[model samples]
Structure formats: C-alpha cells, structure tokens
Target: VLIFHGKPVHGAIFDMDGTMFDTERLRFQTLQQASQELIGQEFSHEYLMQCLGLSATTAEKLAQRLYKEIRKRADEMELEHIRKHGVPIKKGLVQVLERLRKSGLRMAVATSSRRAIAEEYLINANVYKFFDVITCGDEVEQGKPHPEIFLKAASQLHLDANQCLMFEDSENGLTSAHTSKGLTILLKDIKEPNDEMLEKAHFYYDQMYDFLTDLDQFIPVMDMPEMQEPFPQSLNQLTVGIHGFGAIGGGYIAQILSHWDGYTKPKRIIASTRNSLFREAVNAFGTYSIRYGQFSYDERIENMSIVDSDNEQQMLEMYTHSSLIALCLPEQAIESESKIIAKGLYARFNSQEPLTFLIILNKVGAKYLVMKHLKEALLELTNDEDVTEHILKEHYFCDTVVNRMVSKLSNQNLYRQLRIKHNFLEQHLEDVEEDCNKLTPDQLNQASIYVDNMRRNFQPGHILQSMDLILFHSETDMPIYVEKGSPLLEKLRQVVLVDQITDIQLIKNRLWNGVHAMLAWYASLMGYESIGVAMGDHLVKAFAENLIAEVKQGLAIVLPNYAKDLDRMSQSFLDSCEYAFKDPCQRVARDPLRKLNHNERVMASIAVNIRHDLPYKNLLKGAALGYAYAIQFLEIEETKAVEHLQQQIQNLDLSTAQRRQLEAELVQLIQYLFS
Candidate 1:
C-alpha cells in the first residue's frame, strides 16, 4: 500500500491457479482424463496448454471451434466431465490467504474460471471467507483480453482500479488486468513467458513462493502513533454565492472551493449554481455550502433568487439580506439584470435596506452601464428629485476584472485519480491556473464599485484600486468574489492585499494593460486571426519589442522616479504575453476593434511624445498613416470611435501638413486591405 498527495492507497488483488493455487498440473491431468473418458482419445500436451486459465465455457467453445471437422459436440461433454472431477488446490495457498486476511488488507480473486468452479475450489481450499470479492466468467460480458473482469472485481471490492494490483499467469489475463487500468504483476508458470504479457505487467514473479517472500518489500507497514487533542474550530464564516453556474460559473465555483484551505479560515462558504451538478461538485470538495437554483450563468445574484421582479415587496425582501451578490452573467444579460436590481433597490430603499451588487461580467464599462440603467429605473420607480443620490448612499455596484486560465477538468484519468484520492466516486474536477496579469486590488477597485462621488473622493486608495482597465482581454477572467455593496470593495481589497505580492504585482495595471492593448492593435493590424496566434508569430514579437521601446521611452519622460530598464520590462512583457498566448482558451481576443479604440489615453500620451520627439517627418507621417488605416480597417462608425482615434492623433499633435500626408497614405492602406 502507498499514499500519494494526501490520499491513502491500500489493498491488492491476486490471481489463482498457476499464480497462487498451483492447481494447473491437476487441472491438466483432469482435462486429459476427462477427454480420454468422453472422446475415447488422448488429449495432447499442446491442447492442455491452450486451455490453461480459460473459463470452462470459453475453453469448450475454443476446443469445439478447433476440432469442428473431427467432432462437433465432443469438447462440451469433455469439459462437463472435467468439471465434475474438480482439480486439487495449490500448496501454501491456505497459509498465504490466512496471513493476508490477518494482516487487515482486503483481498479479492479475479479469475478467468467459471464462478461455480472458482467458488467450489475456494470452498474446498477453505479460503472463500478470506476474500472480499470474487469476479469470475459470469460477472463479465467479456473475458480476458478485455478489462471487464478486473474492472468488475475492483468495483465489487469498493476500490478504484488504480488502487488495486493484479497477479496473473497467462498473457490474456495480464493484458486484461493491465487494460483494466490497474497495476499488474505477472507470475511465470512456463519456462519462457510471452513478451506482450511481460510488457503489460508492472512486476513479474517466477513462483508464488518468490512473490510471498518479497511481499513485505512491496507492502511495508507505516508507523501510526496515536495522539489525543481537541478538534480545531472554524474562525469565520465566508459565504460565496455564484450567480451563474454555466461553463465559467461552474468552473469558478469549483476552483474557489477545491482549494478552500488555501484561503482564510471559513466557518461556512456557500457555492450556488443553477444546476444541481455544479452544487454537487462543490459539495464533493467538502469546502463550501452548495445551493442549486434558477438563474442563468448570465444573471446577477439578485436575479439568481426566484422573486417576482414586477412585485416590489418580494423583490425587496430578497435583495436586502444578501451579504454578497455576484453576477457571473454574460455581457448582454447585464442590462436586464441591472434593471431588476435597480427596481429591487428602489423597493428596498423605500423600506430602508439595500443590497450591494457586483457584476462579474467580462466586459469593460459593464459596471457603468449597469449603474446607469439601474439609476434610471430607480428614478422612474421613485419619481424622486434625486434617486441616484439615495441609491449611491445605500447600494454599491462595482465593476470587477478577473483573470485566470482555467481549463475544464474533464480528463477521465484525472477524474479516476481524484475519486481514488478523495475516497469518493467523482466523475470530474475543475482545473484552473493563475493568469499572468491578474488585476491588483487597486485595479479591481477602480473597475468594480460605484458609491457616492464623495465616497470615491474620500477613499483615494480604494478609488485607485477600483478603477477599470483591460480586464476582459486577459485569458483567465473567472471572477470569484462577493458582491456586498460598498463592503465588496473592502472584501476584494482584503483578497488582493492578502494574495498579492506588492512589487511583483505593481505592473499588473499600468505596464500590463498598455503592453496588452499595444500587442492587440499590432496583431489586429496585421490581420492575424487571433491575438494569441499573432503573439506566437515573429512579426508580433517584433511589434512587441517596438511597443516596449516606446513604453520605456515614455516611462522615462513621464515619471522621474521610474528607472527605464527596457531589457527587464521587455522580458516581463514578453513573458506575460507568452502566458496569455499559451492559454488553451477558445478565443482570448474579443471585440478587438472596440478594445483598441476604447480608451486611448495611455496610447495617446505615448503617441504625443512619439510625434513631437521623432526628429524626422517621415516617421511621423508613417505612424499617422498606420493610425488612419487602423480606423478604416476597424470600420469606425460611431462618433466616439472617430473621436478616440482623432483625439489620439491630435494628442500626438502632429503638424497639419504631416497629418494630411499620413491620412492620404492611410487611405491607400485601407484600400489595399479592402482589396
């Protein structure tokens, strides 16, 4: 027995006959005698060897197939006669069985023989009670050369396939045990063993005596010293409510709860998903309270609970008491959910209690949109002079940006391992890994919450932390946090402060966002299908280098305290880019055109410096041409898009003549792209 990664591994299964029973000689003699009596013909040594370890029915079937031309019903009668004269039990089998049973290790017999014959032999041998399970021919749909028998045996014993070790003599049995996904040990009965059988077996023994001699070496007892102590008590209650439990929702729920011990002590943490499976998965982890309800992964927590949105009283009751509300809804779903939340807020405000909402949608400006719509609904519902003021005072809505690369853990092997380790029958586990540029508390805070303007002003640190940035662009954006109004910021701040390493995470907002957007633009311009694919290409690499150079130049000029280490910064950017690109996500890049033009403040600042300091007119003209071409390629329709581009170009503050020339060059570039 062995233990791995905090799980116990114990017990094993062994084969009989040639391996432990040593009854092969008697079986062969019985077969020969039966053949002589039934068929009036002497059975050849080759024929006896071929029938070794096969079930009586299978052996009879094969023998009938082989001797079909000679005699049709001969093999069946011969097999029946041989079964009547039962074979003798092997030597030392009784002692070995007793010793194994007394040692407190569970045992099972996985044999290719018929169930009746195997049971009869075990009974005669006085070892049937020592075995926990017996899987014979009748138990399986397919015999040896298939994994069915061994699988059935392991299942009957209440053990995982990986936890069991099988012993077998024949090639077919060995193959079956190996294919059953259990460790196999082969026993050599003949002088030369089959190569294929040897390859499948994990260990090989020449005789049962040899295996018994080395048993202690394979199964060592561990020291277990008893101690007396009081059980530790939980310190705090941490409740995590997931609004959505679809692909991302289910994954987030599992990830946060799977390694619950890694987080702070919690008395109780609840994981809610729309589906029962997601709740069950969370429960399996033994970390959190799991709740199943009616809500799309695209609905907010306020919307997650069943309540009449039109009925103000029921909506208010549901909204007031929730400590944290997380909205893991899709981008489009945010607006409708926001209206419900706003209506709930108006109802709650009239009653003097309001709830905080966290929209965990992976879209920049979602918080703003949600807040905007909610406020409009609240004012309409209230018909008040200033509903935004009262709502801002009572409720808090924060925009959160989450990034983490989490792959769905649907691998059969991993599921088996988890089941064995946990001592439970589980089909799957969620898999997640950290992303490169996860937002800092400052970044999340800035993006996340909405309170009063005065509150924002008073808490500059919190305001700085909460500001929105490029959250949706990152690969790992499975938001797992609470949505407890203004307090949500404090909760998230705690998570960030605790989980974050200050200096290492400093570049998360500033350097990462700038570099990511620049790479996105570069890749989009080159017409690369995806940002990740583009980043992997050499052209993107060169573009990244140029962007970094510009960033370093800009950094040197803007912040005096900032040391311009282009090499260090470039390496960091490249490493982050590699991680972002290597993520096995469907599409990390979304709405590329919107991302590029959304907030050009940082890029515009850099562009301004580039335009002014470019000692050459040709370079300025080329850059302007590139910018103009980007606008045309992206099909800038909205005034905001055109203004954003023009504002960035104007910030570059290039001469009118140079701008005009660049615009002309860009027109040609646009024509070329369209063509």
Candidate 2:
C-alpha cells in the first residue's frame, strides 16, 4: 500500500476542473473565442494556462474586463456543451472512481469552479454521487494555489489532509494540496506538469485512468510475503550478535540492522538473553514486531535465533559465527556478561580475525570497562597473558555514544487494540497459561516470576522479538556515534564515525544525561511519575531550563572546542525528556545511591562547574534535589545521604581550595530540602 509517512491513505481529494474533466481546454477555448469576438485578438496560451485553476473572483481580478468576459462565455459554453454532448469526463474516470469507492476510500471534490457550475457539471457527468464532500471556491475564502480549499475539503471528509490522496492537474491546485501536506498526485492535462509542479507532487500520472493501475499502492493489503525457505548462506553474509537483547539491543539496534540495505546487513541475528521464558516465547511466536513511534509503522524481525546467555555451547556458536557483536547490558551485569563474552573471545583467539564489538550503553567510558572485565575474564579462561592481550588489543572495541530512547507501551488496552488491528503475534495468554500449568511446583513459582517479567517485558503485541527483549519509540532519529578506525566502521550504515568519542561522551553524559537525572529526581520529588508530567509543571520546566543553562556554561569552559555542539545540545536536550516517549521519573532517577558518586551525573556536573569556577548555583540545587530523592526513594536517613554526598564531593578530583569551597556551599545549600 502507498503509505505516506507511514500512514495509509484514508481518503482521496480531487481538483474538479482540470483533474476530473477536460474542462481546462473548454475554459481556454471559451476565453479565446470571447477575446477574439470582443477585441479581435485571442488571449495568449500562457495567460489562459496561468489562469487555469484560478477561481472566477481571482481570475477576474487578474484580468478584470477580459476574465469577466471569459467567465460569462465559458459558463454559457459549458452549459451548452453539457446539454448537447454531456459533461466532458476525463479518461478512466468512472473506473478509477469505482475502484476507489470499492477500496473503501472516502472521496472529496475541491474545485475552484463556482458552486452552481461545479454541481451542474458533476450532475451531468453522473459522477457527483461518488464524492462524499464537495468544497467549492465560493465556499472558501481563498482560491487555487492557497491551501485553504483543499484543507477545507479534507476537514469536511473528517480526515487529516496528510491522510488523503490529493489529485490535481494544474500547478495552482497541486501547490494548494501540497501545501495542505496531502499526498498530492498530479495527472497531466491541457497544461503539462512543470518542473516545480512535479517537484511539489508526491506522485504523477499521464491521465486519470493510469492512476487505477497504481491504486493498490495507496490502500492497505494483506499480501505479506510467505516465509521463505531457509537458504544456505555464505560466510560473507554477516551474522550480527547482540548480547543483552533488551530495549537498546532488540528495539533500537535490531531495528536499524534489520532495515539495513547493503552487503554488511545481517542475514541472521543471534540474540542472547538470560531470560529463558522470553526466549521460549520469542521462538514460539516466530516473529516479534516493532512499531516505529514517530512514523507509525510496524516491522517484524523473522531471522533471529534467540539463545540462552548462560548456555556455554550456544555462546560459543554465537561468538564464532557472528561477524560483529553489540554489548548492550546494564552496568550491574557488566562483570557477569563480560565472562560470557570472554568465552566467545577465547574461542575466536586462534583465528586472530578482526571482529568489531560495539559497547552500547548509556555510561560514558563503557568500552574501557568492557575491556577491563573481558581481559580479566579471558585471563581466567585461557590463563595466557599474551593471548588475552592480543585478543583484547587486536579486535575493535568501538566506544559508541548511542542516543536512541527505545520504549514499550504498557497500556494493556492499547496493546490489545494494536494486536487485533495488526493481527500481530499468534501467542495468546491461554496458550502461555496452559504451558505454565505443566511446570513442577518450584518451577511453577519461578515460571510465574518469569511470566510476569515477560508480560512487563515481552508482551506479544508490545513485544520486540529478539533474544529476550520485548518492544518502542526510539522515535527520535538520534544518530549513533561509533569511534573511527574499526574494520566494520564503513560496513555499518547509519552510524556516524568520530575521531574521538570521549569528548562527545562527556558532552552527552554531562549535559543530556546529567540534566535528565536532575529533572527526573526533581520531578519525582514534585510527585510527577513521568518526566513529561513534570515538564508540564511550569516551575519544574523553568528549573530544568535553568539547570541546563548552568551545565552548558560549565561545558563551554571545559570543552570549548565543542562550542557549537554545546549550543545545539542546550537548545534541544530538554526535548529529549518532553517528546513522545514517556520516560518514568523512577527509571531515570533510579540508583541515586550509586549515581550520587562524584563521577556520576548530577555530581559530575557540579564538579565541572567548581573546577571552572563558574556559577554552580543550579548545579548545587540539582545535587540537593538528588539527595532529597535518595532520602525519600532509597529509604535512607537525610543526614546519612548528606554525609555520603559530602564524601563524594571531597573525593572529587578538584583543587583543595575548590573542594573545600563546594563543601561549604553544599552545606548551606542542602538546607532547602529539609526546610
């Protein structure tokens, strides 16, 4: 189906004069006859074509005496022609109209012609009943080339203009529809489409009849291709592996890899997850779907093999077979997960081939952590320092600044609605529950936990099928930054190659991540569950902007080379919290006990400001808010939280004077939380 911006066309809007009928030629001929009879000279072809789609009012204003005369003659000629030979219908008009009606698409007629003449022409043609709405030039304040008429037609159809297929035959009408943001289609008539007209049009056809052949493109169809027979693949066909197939791994990264078009595109994805129930459900379902939040389209991954991360045999195969791997585990799982990854590294040690590993996590300097843990784990496995050193250094461990926010819909009603509407995954609750009945008592108890976790994480309608990940609005097209010099740098599409990743990571962590933490905590303290809800509170919004201003100031002094990026980040970073994705305050503000460390988000920002000797007023407030959140959410004593924060400040890599000064300032500042 012809899905424009991922939405299927619900209705069709047509320009009545030149589009539905060969009326432009009739009007031009009438104008010529009138001009020659009255002034002994015909109107120029250019002048007549220029006035093709204009309303009588607009045309008359452009050529007062000539247009008025032309209209009077044209009206008489049109009526006489209709009475004698019937309305001049365009080719394949009836067939196209019939097909559109049968396809269940609502139709509208948006005409620059007068209401009386337009009604008469359509009535005479016997095609007037085909349109659900008829909007005339006289009904609208503006004429052709103005979007008002087409917008009015779409409004009368009770559909958004963008949801309608607007058919036009003239530049003015096409411009009007295009400006209305409709999927404007240009059908060639008396005036052939110009360069500008073609550029403005979404689709173009030679005649109205030709549109019928391509009608299937604009409507929804259930002709999804049947699953192909498994073809024997070559080693060159890349098989990408993803460890910790949760939100970023399955939802964001897999979506990008699945849609990849070139040689490096994965023929198969080996996704590893520790969640056994999720793996079972994914394998049973055969496919997992993802709904791109912004574009409003559904995509399913069918060529994925979900394996247990704990299974040593499966991990070895995933590591050996895959050309590239992405590590997308949580910070807590780093040590344990690295052990699994190290086994894979050990298996591939003999080949000494260049394998790319994308360290995909929110934490800055995550690749170094992976390297440390991988080396430690591999040393125990191989117990050979040289082999482990060679394995770690030879293969690429690209540090990536992944900036996509992939999330799932938790509303059960919406999930049910989407499931039924899309006819998504076939695994129903009854089948899953029946299978759960077969487990032993202890297994049943564990199964219940996994089932609940699966419901929260792998709800089929909401499911993003990979290893164990469940579905997402990585709605924003935030670019992924991968460090350069990797063999797979050119191979991976949609990733930006950078000379240095640490500076970018610092900017992301200190500005976006840091501000996000401050807002999340402050928002949580203010009793807002979601970041977007807190953003609605004018006071919270004001404070969030202020915190951003302070952080940006510190960044300017610290990373002056990234001045433009800082400016851009400051302007747009707040939107990351406010956009379509509803990030939870609890999720963003989670682990405040750990996040309160000197090197973490809010504290890190405060430390930057202190070192630079800039205004740390907002940053200080943010730290105070962080302490308040920790005391309340973490169930810790206020005094104890304050003491820990004080210690974190003293531990900061600052001058003795700077450290002492911040401690004094924080002591005075944190009083507001209790007061």
Candidate 3:
C-alpha cells in the first residue's frame, strides 16, 4: 500500500445557485411559469438551461421578453420561500463550509446573481458570514465563462485564483473556474455533469455530502473542534511583517522573502504604507511587478496584504502576530513611527512572544538608531525605563547592510524622460509642491520651472493602476549581510550572517554607498539624470572607478578580514552601476551636506587613509566633489558650505600638515567642475 499527499488549498470560492444552494431548479421552474404566463409560451428545458450561470444582463440580452417578465417574479418567489422555510441550502454545505472554516480556509462567493438577491439568499441560508468576499455578477464587467468574476473574488481575498478551490455546477462556471487556474470542483445539480466538465474539473461529486466525505482525498480537512481561530500547523506558516511597502520593502525584500528557498519561508507577508493612493492601488490590484536589469523582464509578486500605516490598531496586530518584522522604512519615518513600533513591541511583550526584527534601513548604525528611538518611545508609553529596557531585552534586533542597488523607476524624471504611456506610478501635485520646497534653489533652477508648471496644472487621477504600480529596478542580486546570531540567518535565502557586522558595515558604507554618492555628485553636476547614463560617460566611469579604488584601500584597512573580497566586490558594484535602472543622481546626492560629516562616508574614508598614511588623492577628490555638489544644491551659502566642509575636515583626527595639505588639495579639486 502507498500513501499520497493531496493538493494544498488556502481558500475556496463557491458559485451560489447550484453549488451552495438547491436554487437552480427553483429558479428554472419560476422562469418557466413566468414565461408561459407573460408570453403564452413556456421556454423549453434546453433553452432555460442555457441561461444557467449567465449574468442577468447577458440573459436579459438573449431573451428580453421572458427574462424581463421572470426576473422580479423569480427573485420574489425565491425570497418568499427563503422567508418562510429559510433558503434551500444544498445537502452537506454547512458541514463542508464548517470543516473548511475550521481548517483555516478563507472562503468567497462568486455568483452570476445580482448583489441584493445573492446577499438575501446567503443571509437567509445562515452562511453569509462564512464568506470573506461576495463577488456578484453585477460587480463584474463580464459574466460566467469569463474569468473576471472568479478572479475578482480571489483578488478580494488577497489571493491569486490558483491558490483557491472553485466550486461550481454549471458548465459555464466550470469553464470560468478552469480558466482562472483554480482547482475547479463540480457538484451535480439541475445541470448534469458532462464528460468535458468531468475531464476539466479537479474533482466531481454528486452532492456536497459526497465531496465533504471524500474531501481528505483531495485536501486535508482538520478534525479539531470548532474555535474562534485555527492554530498554524508550523512556525513556517507565520506571516512576515514589513513596516514600509516602498521600493525596498515591496520591491527587493518582499521579492526575496516570498521566493525564499529555506525551511522557514513565511507563508504570508503583511506590509504597511502611509500613501493612501498607493494603498488603494494595492487593494485594487492585489499584485505588483518588479523589473530586474535594464533590459528587464517582470516578476509579479502576489499574496501581499497592505495596511495603512496610520491604522494603529492594524499596525499593533501586525507586530503582535508576526514571527519576524523587517523595518524597511526611511530614517525620517523611523523617527515618526517609533511610537507605533514601541506599542507593537509592548504587545509582543504582553503575549510573551519573542520577535526578531531585521533592521534594513540601509543606513550605517541603523540598529542603534532604531533601538534609541524605540527606547525613547517606550519610555513615553510606560514612563518606566526599567520596564522599557525589559521589553526591549526580550526581542532580538539584527543590523543589516544591504548591497542591492534597488531604485524606484516611476519618478517624474524617468516618467518624462522615458515617456512611458502606461504602468507608471503618479504622485499628487500637492506632494510635488511639498517636494519642491525641500529642494535647494539651484535644483529648482536646474529643473527649469517644470515643478511650478506641474503645480499650476495640478489635476487628479494621475495615479495609475496597481498591476505595474511603483516599478522598481534592481541592477544586481547582491547578497545582504545581517549581524551574527540572527535567527533569520537561514530564513532569508540571500542573507549572510557574520560575526563582525560593524566591520562589514564600514566596508559596504564606504566602498559602496560612499562611492555611490561620489558618482551621484559628479553625475548630477554634469547634468546626468541617472547612474547608468552617467556611467556611459567615459570620464565619469573612470572617475568612479578611481574613487572606488581609494575608498577600498581605507575600507580594507578598517576591515582586514574583508580585505580579500574588497576588490572584487567593489568592481562588481562599478560593473553593475553601468546597467543600473535610471537611478536618479538627485536621489543619491540627497542631503549632501549631512553626508559630508567627518564620520560619514566620504570624509570618513579620507580620515581612514589619513590615519594610515596611504594615498588619499581619489578620496580627497570625492570629498571635494561632495562639497561642490553641496555648494550648488544646499540652501546654505557657498561660504557657509565651504566652512562646513573645513569644519568636517578639522573634526577628523589629522596632523596640522595633513589637514593643511588636504584643505589645499580640496580647494584645487573643487574647481574641476568649473574646468
């Protein structure tokens, strides 16, 4: 004897009339009586049967007189029967539904009936609450035999159709379900199951009872007592939460986590975004695509549920139940959303569940940044430092250094440059003005009053649909490093866990981010819109390679263990930059003044070289380029900006001779832009 595994099903979608209720014959009889009374001619059985599973609109179009006369009468007769003796629910429907519900399967109703009648029947049958979504014929543009209705039903459940089991009785409904790629099951009713349907359906049953009895042969049905919630079969099924659903959260990280090859791959992903329009798009489409490489093919990611960030209760629930949380929000958002994170941590604390948080902000010392803000926020909540510390101590936090160069592709610059007619994300005109205010005077001038004209001609409905909403372009699938001892070490497929996280952090920051910034500054100064465009310029590519070489020397010295891998890694970054997807120079060179701090990227690399007495020409040139970019783009005065650069250099521990020499060289190199 042999044992076999059954198909895995997460949800079920049921057709209303014949599959879930014994109402098709009732409707047929009512239609026949009405047709005979109104037209003096009863519709034939074959003709009436043809109307099964068809939308009222489509049926009305086929036989206007009979359909017009019978529609109201048939609905009233059905309602009358339901009101008196309750709905004529199919045999074993309640049992099957109950078993599926208890087994943690989401359910939906996809029917060709109008919404009002469908709701009335479902409610009277006492099974309306069993369904998570009710998709009616009136709700879809196309009816049965077209996959739209069933697809919408699956989408409403935040699932793809292939992930659901479809129950239908009519040949038309079966066709639709089969086309939807769902596991279609046919239950015989007024319409006898044909050989074609039997061949098409994954399962065929005489009644709901037979299907329920044999359900285990197709899919497992839990035998446990009914409860408010079903327990997960394993920890691997737990949902992974992402705090932000922007480029990184929804793009790279979600892509990796969903396609994970490890044993602890999360069964679901829940993300939060503050953008209301983005949330609408996510809800409407239930899927998104990412384009990898410049000559890109699309990767469609599904089964991701997005919640509004401002919804505190929902955010709290996410933090409470998620086994692992990835904080993919921006640094600015971290400051604003720390209270929410603290509340979630407290909720997890109350439940005595230890949660692992992956700090994926891409900023150096992000773990410390998160911890500091979380502590402050917790203090505000509990008003007790010790309690806050205890709560924090219960959770594990891991710092991460991300090397993937993921870039958003739907910004106005690319939109205008590419002239993409469809599938590009749009932003609000008000938000554009808000962004305008954040830019320096020089940037405004560079943009040439286009921002002003956009604000003036502000119009609604600029946002696109979610199918291709917020496209992200990634140059390479570089491995990410997480701090050692993280439980997620093996969970994320491309993640590497290392003991010396800080050392690795320095290497990535200086070699990758620092070199990235240098290229951005030079590229922006030279009027290039994207990294790929700039890398095409022989002078810029050569400049970037030289800067990377200098940055590497300091990084290797700082992290000797990583010395061997530095050259290859840095070369790969340079090689990939040439193919990067329209990564904006402005985005990379953002807040140039802050990035020029003594302990920050460019200056820090210079400090390392100065201390080690190594060649600092390229590193010093990068700093000069950074200062030049800041002098042009920063709202501050040129003298003040130059003074700030000098102050940054002074803060670095350098001999007077070393500092003076560096200052003279920076002054000379700063003129390169003019030359």
Candidate 4:
C-alpha cells in the first residue's frame, strides 16, 4: 500500500464545480449579468437556484420557468465566465489530492458540465493529472438525481457503487450519489443544498482541506446516520395521505401510527373520509386502540388529519402536499376517489417532487385503472391538458398484492381498534412436512385459531399470510417483508413486499379460494353439506390433497416456488396445515355465482392458465365440479349459467380458437360431470 492517506476507500468520485472549485459564485454572477443585459433586470436568485446541478435536458425545461431570452444569454455568458475566470480553483485542493494519491486510491471527476469545458478547467488548474477518469454531463443519457453520472464513474472505475467515496455540493449531486448507494461527503460549497439534500448526505464537511487535516477522523466512513432509517423522527417531510381508511388503509396508518411496525412513520397521515362519526372520534381522541392479533394498545398517530371527501379544496390541498399516497379503497369506490385524487394532483405538477401512489387492492391493472379514472376526473376539474400532463409527469402509480389474515373492529369507543391474526404465516409454513418442497391451501383453518381474536362477518377462507402488512408499492418497493418492527407488531409477524404480486395472486385465488369453493359445492351436492363432513371422506381428501400436484404442474413454466426440492416444500406445507384448524367449505363457497365469473376466482384461474399456454384440465375439472354441484341448488338456471360462462370465455382476452374450444368444453364438461 502506498502510504500517505486515502487508504479507507477504493475509489473517490468528485463533483467538479463547487466541490473542487468555487465556480458557482462566479457562474451566478455571470448569470445575473446576462439577465440584466438581456431582460433589463438581474437574474432571479430562485431561477438561478433551479439551474444548479442540472443536465442539458433538465435546464431546457427549467428555462421555461423564466424568460427564455434571459436563460439564453446566461448560457452564452457562462461560456465567457469560464473563459475569463481561467479555472478558479479552491485553496489547498492540490495538497488534499496529493495526499490521497500517495495513499493509492483511484479517483475520478463526475461533473454536470460539458466534457470540453470540464477538461479545459481541470487541465488549467493542473488537477486533471490526478483524476483517472472524467465523466461529463453529455456522456450519459441522464444527469444528477438520476445517478447515471456517478453510476458510470463507478462502472468505469470497476468498483461496486458502495466501494467508491463520492463528493458533492449540490442537491442533485447528493441525491445521485446517495441513491447510487455510494459513500458520500459534501463540502461547504458556495451555496448550501436544502434539507432534502442534507438528509441524504452521509457526512458534511467544511472544506477539502479540513477533511484532509483530520484524515484519520473521516476515513473508513464510520459513525454515520442510516442511509434509510426504518424509524423516521417524525412524519413531517413527505406527507403520506391515505384514502379509504378501512381495513387495509387502516392497517397502514394504524400500525405506523403506533410505531408498531419498524417503518419510519411519516410526519402526517391524512385520512380522506365523509364519516362524521369517525372524524368525531379522531377529533375527540388523538389516538386509536387496535388489537393486532393478541396485542392491543392505543395507537397515538402523531400528525393525523381527517379530510372530508366532499370538501373539494381540502381534498385538493391534501393530495397536492402528499409525496406518497396509499389508496386502500376497494374496487367499487375507485370511480369517485379518482376525481378527488386528480384534483389534488393538478397543482402538484409545478413542484417536481416525486409523488408515488400505492394501490392496496386485490384487483389487477390498478395503476391503469387509477390513471384512467384520475385523468378522466382531471379533465373535468381543470379543463387544462397541460395541467393533466404535468400531473402525470410527477405521479407514479403502483399496484400491490397484500396477503394477510385481517379482520376489523369498528367501534364508537374513543379509539378505533383493529383485530389481526398475525401467526397465519406460521400456520401455513409449519405445515410443510420438511421433506416436501411445496404446499397448497386446503384444510388450513382446521390447523388452529390457536388464539381467537375479535374477527369477521366476512368471506372467510384459507389465509396464507406471507407477511402481516406488506406493500407491493413500487417495483423497487416490492418483495419487502417487515420482520423488524415494534416488539408486539413483530411478534408472530411475517411480512413481505415483492415486485411481482401477479403470480402470488394467481396462487392465492386459485389454489385456495377456487378449489375451496369446489369442495363446498361438491359437498352440498353429495348431501354431506358440511365441509368438515366432506373432508372426512377419504376420496375427497385424496382429491383435494393431490390437486396441488396439478397446480405445481401448471405453474412449472411460470412461478415454481419450490421446484428445487418438491418433497421438502410439499412436506413443509402438509405439516403446517395438517393441524387443528377450522376451515368450512361453506365460508369459502359463500358467493359461488360470483366466484364462477371469468374475472373472479375459478374462471380467472382457468383464464390465467390458458393465457400462459398451460393446460387447465385440473382447473376445468374443479370448475366443472363446482358448477355442476352448484347448479343443483344455486339460484341461477344451469343452462343460463353455462351460457353466461360461455359468454365470459368468448369475451376473455384469448385467441378465438382457444376461446371456442374452451367454451365448447366448458359446457360439455359440466353436462358430462352432472350426468
């Protein structure tokens, strides 16, 4: 090892302008002069601030916020300032580099300035010799805040993103560096970046000289704040507005409000509702009581506000300020909520802060649904296409799959209490016979409600809680399992946040609900009306147990969760679900007519397999059995039901040949099965 300093990091990436040179001050002066010459006034500091740390493309858009001619003059004069200033360099800069160079660290300069200008300045100051690589703003498609520049530097340096120590003095640069997951240090540049930038930085320095003097102190990059804190001090920064304060949304706010989940609780959680009684409760008591599984406590939500849905202005304001909004509302409420969300989003287009939306619903294509309805509402509220476009640019909508066994307790008591069964995961997992590689959902409830909590007047079925409270919020935020939380929330909790909830939904709706209903209808038809009675049948038990083999075969080309060790996975499941649980087929079959719809549960599974070119014979058998059994006593006419089922198949997004074939067989099979 070469021995002076800089041994701590493998590489160092520097932002050229403010970090290496006091160039921002000179540039701002030149920009101001250019504005005065072109527009008869000095450049507005606010406008100049927007131009800082921007790419060529971003600057073009930022120019629209000011006089185009003044911006044009500033660009022209900026070239003149660099030419005249002859590369004004920071004091003690060369000494800091010489020290780091002696210690054998690879170095590079990542700058937003054009390649030609940056090279000229670096060479003029004789600092160019120290850097191994120079990445320009034009070299990458995107610039700062997008991380393309720093990422390129790291790639060229042949180091992991975190292996490099990045230096910055601008908002965008810090954002890029922090998001790149690299070690970051900010210098006391001409202009201090705002708090958004400050929070992201790992360390702040007075100057390069100061850091080099105390080299040992800052080396190794230790003693720093969390890059992403699980528990944020307060929920003030980015307000997370949640719509549909029901079971799902209620879980989000209630859990976070109590700080039960190891989530950085937001500063504000504004609930949009028209429920006066609920608002009355919220107003009277600044908290709520929730019994999450066996644990119960009053959840004191720090900055909670209830927005009345009918109050248009209040709704708009709340939506505008929200950086992250959770739409926990159901399918039926989408039409009405979209309009309010759009109105809230309209004015938010001006500020370029990221506005993320998490739709916690079982329905697919949620993003498309929200976008379509939100825009349809936008046109009515704003009547301005520009406003709509602006809002779209700032917003990101994500659909999620949440797997949990939750029930609610809505009370008029001072605090709202929610009941949960968090151990539903262990109930599913422990059943795996250890030697089997896969598992299925059947006879799950008979395992044990080991502990009963205040629960449901709802459609109860086998629950495979992969996690207690999970958000498939963004593709990046997917597949997250929050096992780390407040002591109670963490107890018996298995939470997962994952990107692809599609396959998960398929497994859930099909293997659990679909087959469970089939069992129910079959029992009803065979005169052993009780699902428990049906399970006692050896043939029926064998049928239900073996059906999982069909499910695995169907998903072989798709999601194979336990393809590697089927025995272990299979055994793992059998052991967990083989216990004393009380699942009734009637509960699963509550809405047979609805479940038979192509878009609902059973037919949906059939449609999924057909779409994937997977055989659906097993699914068809289940469907046929379900329909034939239900037709005997189900309110609808069997012929009419079959005809409608045929209609659904034809209208389904399938090839005509497959549709016709599937439709013909669907009717033919039910009749044959009935016989």
lDDT of each: 0.51, 0.74, 0.76, 0.62
C-alpha RMSD (angstroms) for model 4: 20.4
**Per-candidate TM-score against the hidden true structure:** 0.39, 0.56, 0.57, 0.46
Task: Give candidate 4 regions above 4 Å deviation.
Answer: 1-237, 252-264, 274-283, 294-303, 350-352, 410-547, 558-595, 599-601, 607-618, 621-643, 652-675
User: lDDT by residue for model 3 over 152-182, one digit each (tens)?
Assistant: 9999998888779899989999999999998
Q: Which residue runs does candidate 3 get wrong by more than 4 Å?
A: 1-237, 261-268, 411-467, 671-675
Which stretch of 10 consecutive residues in model 2 shows the poorest summed lDDT? 226-235
Highest TM-score model number: 3
- Sort by TM-score, top down from the best: 3, 2, 4, 1
Given candidate 2, what's the lDDT at residue 66?
45
**How many steric clashes between backbone atoms does each model show?**
20, 2, 0, 51
For residues 560-631, write the lDDT of model 2, one tens digit per residue.
889778877766777666753456677778777677788877788887877677787888888778877877
Cα TM-score of candidate 3:
0.57
Question: Quick one: best lDDT, which candidate?
Answer: 3
Candidate 3 residue pairs in clash (backbone atoms < 3 Å): none
Q: Return the lDDT, model 4, position 501.
A: 55
RMSD values for the candidates in order, in angstroms, are 27.1, 22.7, 17.5, 20.4
- The Cα error of candidate 1 at residue 241, in Å, is 4.5
Ranking by lDDT: 3, 2, 4, 1
